[PDB]
Design a protein around this ligand. Sequence first.
Ligand SMILES: CS(=O)(=O)Nc1cccc([C@@H](CC(=O)O)NC(=O)c2ncnc3[nH]ccc23)c1
Length: 164
Amino acid sequence: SFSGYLKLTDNVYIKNADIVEEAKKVKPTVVVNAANVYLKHGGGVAGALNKATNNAMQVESDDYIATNGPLKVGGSCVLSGHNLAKHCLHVVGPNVNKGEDIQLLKSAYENFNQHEVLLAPLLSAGIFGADPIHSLRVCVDTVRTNVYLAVFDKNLYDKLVSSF
Ligand SMILES: CS(=O)(=O)Nc1cccc([C@@H](CC(=O)O)NC(=O)c2ncnc3[nH]ccc23)c1
């Protein structure tokens, strides 16, 4: 039920929207979380998604980590979407502020290819420290499935479209 999106390519779409509000409106099959390897959803997209689930996402994530250990940078896991989606694909993009290799951003986007359609943020952008224009280019050049990108900041949305 996605609406108001601008088509960038055959499979990539973009909208100036809060991913939490977009998830509550659409209730997609898959919402992507901008996760860290420990699934500690403190801030950014992860903190906002977890807060919308009344912390049920953090409780579920802590049990997952206790059983399986941390994810790899560039890796992912599928957990419940709670009240936002059927599923949440927790994807770990490299955190540039922590010295993580930006080359892992392509591996992180490759996780999207296991799902026919997804609502997602730009990986590694925001508090993760990477250039969002770079993140959109890697998204477009890596993801082959249908991805609906929610870009929170209006000025960033405008720059992303103008420079595409
Ligand atoms: C530094 S920047 O990436 O160019 N600018 C930026 C400006 C404002 C925000 C951001 C990042 C910050 C971050 O969550 O780590 N936000 C998002 O990517 C985002 N996207 C969709 N829906 C959302 N709901 C809550 C956050 C959010 C980034």
